[PDB]
Design a protein around this ligand. Structure first.
Ligand code: SF4
Ligand SMILES: [Mg+2]
Ligand SMILES: [Zn+2]
Ligand SMILES: [Zn+2]
Lengths: 116, 114, 181, 431
RNA sequence: GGAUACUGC
């Protein structure tokens, strides 16, 4: 503990969800906080949106880790699986492209949601 | 060279190659560790605040080294006991901090920089 | 988790709890052993420093006795077996509790606890450390003058006792050869 | 008040050996040679770092104690093989172990367990059923060899309990054949009355020493009792070290006329000394140049050689500690003393009593009894006595002060090669 | 959400 010897914020995101978030993101956030888990489409959409608002790679990683850990899953499982997706949304791996946030046209014409 | 000294500390600057072999006290261990942590934190703060070639940087770093009693200036007199003590401090403290700053890559980088 | 130093005033008999070298803030800060905790009491514990020394030695004896009592408790919540006897049957983690035969016996008062208690008793009498770390700037200036030299000397003498005790503890020499190889 | 007006001054409360005159005289330590018994193991003569015991180290020390005593007993008894205590045994098997209590209370015949060593039993325990044993005497921490059967694999039933084997006595060299008989006065603390800090009993004893001029004076602690009512309630106006220094100065300077070798043994009740057993010698007092050769600051326990006579001594109240735990089938003190001698340790009780702090590495290194002592000084809160246990003269001189009233001391005469009658005479006398 | 591998039992 020698290194720790005396000699945008995640918390406000919820606040934003009250007013600024468009109804799509409001619904996604409500479901996420209700169940601490999102199917793939929701993960992609919400991750891209939180990238758009400005949540940095470290910030987004922390937020997703904290939110998913409550879903009764192993902590290491998150780094094993979802870390690559989170990195890719920010153009960190693979083709390494700064993927832009979904446009309303894409969201309307993107994968059609189903039950769940 | 009063009682238990030697040629173990010829020069002020050293590459910290040979680990210490002495038996020190727990109080000495803690004092040396904390003192060198203060020195390194002062180095980091002055590096952030000032340009390392600046005269303000040099003055403040000399003040900190004097306050914590670390070797910073040569002495063309001889190896005086007090000087020996200071050098011993430096040599042990460094390795103690090595033990403190080798667990994580981040920490390692920080240590190296300072 | 360390017990604080309890001293009963000889005059008024009120308990004084000491947890730091200095008490108060700003220019109203003075060493703890300068004035009694009872406003109506004018007795200065610094006057009865022989009694403070004796109480310190008695407390150190009490803590050493607690450590050497060697009380062990089972780590299992559903067993919590408490024994003085250390069994020779060991698992990889330590002594095996002979009540349930499935959990480890942990020391009720480990060596670290005693070491930290002695270090705390040294801390509550470390004038120089308190001045450098605990005390603020204006408070340090107010305390680094005369009118406190006698208190400083008495505090140094009291810290000498805890230092002497700690010098005899194996939890007081660090072999740097074993660390760096 | 009560002590100063006593009427039984000088009364001989107990006697043993050759009858002597009403007055005892010594050689003033003229032809006297006092040293620590030179055995294979080095003695405890300086402080050792303590307060750091690893449970593994305690396990190792206890296990090696059991193993070593069992090896000696196996060689002595020509036992073929030891068997694991825990394993079932339909036929009779010989098992080595140490006794203990299945609970935290005091041992009784229905709460006895035998714990084996690491070599033969992996440290496993087994309950013991003493229904088939006709005669026994067991205390916790006692290393025993038993023949028995374990039909259920869950309860060992001893049928024979092997007796203890004391160490051989010392064979003195002829260097001290021509030395005269030596007089030893032994006293144990407390030295002051419960309500005083003036050391009146100590002054009376010093007067007795100067009057009789003994060759050795063995003073056992406490010298500044921790249980003294003044000490506990913090009524002392001077530091503990100062009171102890005053007491030691009184003892040493007051004995100058007698020229008597002083042997000072610390006690666990010494409020000013390190609370650990084996206790290192006192080191806070530097005798003047004229008393350096006379004062011997020894450790607790101590094995002393006096012109070839081996005297064992301990300040610890061994008899009180073991009497509270010893269980027998049917003299109790003689049994406990024989147990101490046969276990070959100055503190064989495990777990110890609540009033003693034991560092087990130091216990292993400095509590083995080198030989069976010619005289064994064992002060106790129990009644004074002079007993002959297996040829060793065990002396309990009581304590110099018993509460508000004066206590007792002991005086004995020792000569190497006398008649085995190394103890010519011994007497417990009143102060 | 998908795709590519190959271990096990
Ligand atoms: S997808 Fe576009 S139009 Fe539909 S709710 Fe979200 S922001 Fe509004
Ligand atoms: Mg999935
Ligand atoms: Zn008061
Ligand atoms: Zn248990």
């Amino acid at each position: 503990h020698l290194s720790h010897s005396y000699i945008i914020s995640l918390e406000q995101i919820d606040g934003f969800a009250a007013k600024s978030f468009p109804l799509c993101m409001r619904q996604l956030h409500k479901s996420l906080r209700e169940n601490h888990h999102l199917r793939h489409g929701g993960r992609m959409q919400y991750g891209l949106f939180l990238k758009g608002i400005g949540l940095t790679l470290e910030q987004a990683l922390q937020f997703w880790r904290l939110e998913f850990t409550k879903g009764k899953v192993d902590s290491e499982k998150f780094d094993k699986v979802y870390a690559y997706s989170i990195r890719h949304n920010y153009g960190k791996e693979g083709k390494r492209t700064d993927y832009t946030p979904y446009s309303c046209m894409k969201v309307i014409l993107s994968n059609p949601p189903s039950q769940g | 060279t009063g009682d238990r000294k030697g040629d173990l500390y010829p020069s002020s600057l050293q590459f910290y190659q040979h680990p210490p072999t002495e038996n020190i006290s727990l109080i000495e261990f803690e004092t040396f560790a904390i003192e060198r942590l203060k020195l390194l934190k002062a180095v980091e703060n002055l590096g952030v605040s000032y340009v390392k070639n600046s005269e303000e940087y040099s003055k403040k770093l000399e003040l900190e080294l004097r306050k914590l009693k670390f070797p910073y200036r040569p002495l063309h007199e001889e190896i005086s006991d007090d000087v020996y003590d200071l050098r011993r401090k430096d040599h042990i403290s460094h390795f103690i901090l090595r033990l403190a700053y080798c667990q994580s890559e981040d920490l390692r980088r920080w240590f190296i920089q300072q | 988790d360390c017990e604080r130093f309890k001293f009963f005033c000889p005059k008024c008999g009120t308990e004084n709890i000491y947890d730091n070298v200095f008490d108060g803030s700003g220019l109203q800060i003075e060493p703890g052993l300068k004035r009694c905790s009872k406003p109506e009491c004018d007795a200065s514990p610094l006057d009865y420093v022989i009694q403070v020394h004796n109480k310190l030695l008695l407390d150190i004896r009490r803590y050493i006795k607690k450590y050497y009592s060697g009380w062990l408790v089972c780590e299992e919540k559903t067993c919590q077996n408490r024994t003085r006897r250390l069994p020779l049957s060991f698992s990889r983690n330590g002594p095996i509790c002979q009540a349930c035969s499935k959990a480890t016996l942990r020391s009720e008062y480990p060596e670290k606890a005693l070491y930290t208690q002695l270090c705390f008793y040294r801390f509550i009498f470390d004038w120089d450390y308190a001045l450098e770390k605990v005390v603020s700037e204006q408070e340090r200036g107010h305390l680094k003058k005369k009118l406190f030299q006698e208190s400083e000397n008495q505090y140094k003498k009291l810290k000498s006792t805890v230092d002497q005790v700690l010098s005899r503890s194996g939890y007081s020499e660090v072999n740097l050869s074993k660390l760096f190889q | 008040q009560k002590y100063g007006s006593r009427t039984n001054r000088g009364e001989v409360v107990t006697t043993y050996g050759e009858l002597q005159g009403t007055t005892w005289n010594g050689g003033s330590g003229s032809n006297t040679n006092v040293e620590l018994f030179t055995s294979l193991d080095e003695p405890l003569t300086k402080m050792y770092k303590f307060m750091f015991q690893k449970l593994m180290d305690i396990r190792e020390v206890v296990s090696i104690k059991i193993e070593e005593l069992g090896a000696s007993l196996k060689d002595h008894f020509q036992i073929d093989e030891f068997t694991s205590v825990s394993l079932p045994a339909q036929e009779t098997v010989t098992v080595l172990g140490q006794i203990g209590c299945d609970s935290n209370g005091k041992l009784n015949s229905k709460s006895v367990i035998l714990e084996g060593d690491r070599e033969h039993s992996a440290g496993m325990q087994v309950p013991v059923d003493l229904s088939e044993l006709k005669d026994y005497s067991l205390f916790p921490g006692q290393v025993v060899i038993m023949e028995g059967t374990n039909s259920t694999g869950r309860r060992f039933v001893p049928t024979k309990l092997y007796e203890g084997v004391p160490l051989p006595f010392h064979q003195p060299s002829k260097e001290f054949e021509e030395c005269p008989q030596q007089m030893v006065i032994t006293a144990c603390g407390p030295f002051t009355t419960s309500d005083t800090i003036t050391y009146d009993a100590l002054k009376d004893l010093i007067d007795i020493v100067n009057r009789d001029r003994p060759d050795i004076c063995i003073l056992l602690g406490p010298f500044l009792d921790a249980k003294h009512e003044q000490i506990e309630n913090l009524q002392l106006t001077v530091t503990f070290e100062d009171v102890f220094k005053r007491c030691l100065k009184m003892i040493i300077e007051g004995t100058r006329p007698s020229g008597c070798h002083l042997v000072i043994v610390p006690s666990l009740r010494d409020v000013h000394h390190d609370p650990v057993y084996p206790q290192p010698p006192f080191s806070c007092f530097e005798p003047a140049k004229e008393d350096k050769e006379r004062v011997h600051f020894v450790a607790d326990p101590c094995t002393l050689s006096v012109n070839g006579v081996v005297i064992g001594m301990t300040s610890t109240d061994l008899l009180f500690h073991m009497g509270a735990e010893e269980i027998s089938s049917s003299d109790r003190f003689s049994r406990i003393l024989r147990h101490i001698l046969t276990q070959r340790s100055y503190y064989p009780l495990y777990p110890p009593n609540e009033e003693i702090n034991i560092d087990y590495e130091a216990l292993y290194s400095y509590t083995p009894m080198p030989v069976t002592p010619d005289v064994f000084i064992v002060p106790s809160e129990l009644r004074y006595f002079i007993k002959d246990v297996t040829g060793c003269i065990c002396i309990n001189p009581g304590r110099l002060t018993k509460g508000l009233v004066g206590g007792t001391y002991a005086r004995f005469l020792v000569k190497s090669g006398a008649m085995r009658s190394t103890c010519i005479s011994a007497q417990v006398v009143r102060v």
